[PDB]
Amino acid sequence: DSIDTPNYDVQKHINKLCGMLLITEDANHKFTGLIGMLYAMSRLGREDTIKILRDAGYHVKANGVDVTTHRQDINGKEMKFEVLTLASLTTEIQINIEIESRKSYKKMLKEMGEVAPEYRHDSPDCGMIILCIAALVITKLAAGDRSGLTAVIRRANNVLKNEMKRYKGLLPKDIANSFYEVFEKHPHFIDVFVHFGIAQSSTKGGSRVEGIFAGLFMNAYG
Numbered sequence: 001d002s003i004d005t006p007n008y009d010v011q012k013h014i015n016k017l018c019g020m021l022l023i024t025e026d027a028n029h030k031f032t033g034l035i036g037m038l039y040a041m042s043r044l045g046r047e048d049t050i051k052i053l054r055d056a057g058y059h060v061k062a063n064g065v066d067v068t069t070h071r072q073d074i075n076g077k078e079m080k081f082e083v084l085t086l087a088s089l090t091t092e093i094q095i096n097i098e099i100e101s102r103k104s105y106k107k108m109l110k111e112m113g114e115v116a117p118e119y120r121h122d123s124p125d126c127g128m129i130i131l132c133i134a135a136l137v138i139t140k141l142a143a144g145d146r147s148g149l150t151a152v153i154r155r156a157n158n159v160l161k162n163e164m165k166r167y168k169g170l171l172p173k174d175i176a177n178s179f180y181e182v183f184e185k186h187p188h189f190i191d192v193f194v195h196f197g198i199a200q201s202s203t204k205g206g207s208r209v210e211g212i213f214a215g216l217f218m219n220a221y222g
């Protein structure tokens with residue numbers, strides 16, 4: 001029925017939401033599967049996402065995704081939070097993700113001073129790092145269970161070694177579980193993910209993380 005169809009205009013915001021989870025020490029990855037799927041949809045854009053969903057036979061009521069402001073007190077001081085209009089993810093859950101991310105960011109500040117771009121929550125490759133785990137999970141979905149979980153974790157520790165040094169919240173077990181859950185609960189995300197992975201993998205050049213993603217995705221075929 002009602003599905004969030006993020007467009008290109010919110011892609012940066014979703015990438016930062018992925019980044020916020022990636023910098024959180026012992027992050028609660030309950031919504032990471034859904035957030036990574038929202039990121040993949042924002043890369044495809046609303047028109048292509050709806051086309052994929054309808055072509056696959058799904059009944060879709062598209063919910064447009066805008067950025068909005070919510071006010072909330074922190075230490076008795078009013079803070080302004082930018083959130084997305086998502087039918088699948090409440091304002092409260094999004095704000096809690098940011099609050100927990102800010103606590104981990106303060107610990108990083110105390111240890112190393114201001115944080116370098118590649119260790120920040122707004123690094124351009126944050127959404128793609130999350131989708132690297134999804135590429136691994138998609139290879140083990142046919143089993144009808146989570147038996148492939150151990151192999152997912154082993155491959156992620158090897159292939160994503162550099163990204164794990166950058167991010168304390170890059171916990172392959174928890175992120176892989178969140179994707180297994182998102183794909184079991186909402187199988188239409190499998191179609192979306194596969195179309196994303198194909199379109200992503202054919203792109204020329206790009207970042208180191210884009211190359212890692214293309215390698216993992218293509219390894220789910222050969």
Ligand SMILES: N[C@@H](Cc1ccccc1)C(=O)O
Nearest residue numbers: 020098101102103105121122
């Ligand atoms: N806006 C600040 C503080 C912040 C840290 C982590 C998450 C959200 C906000 C920064 O990006 O440096």
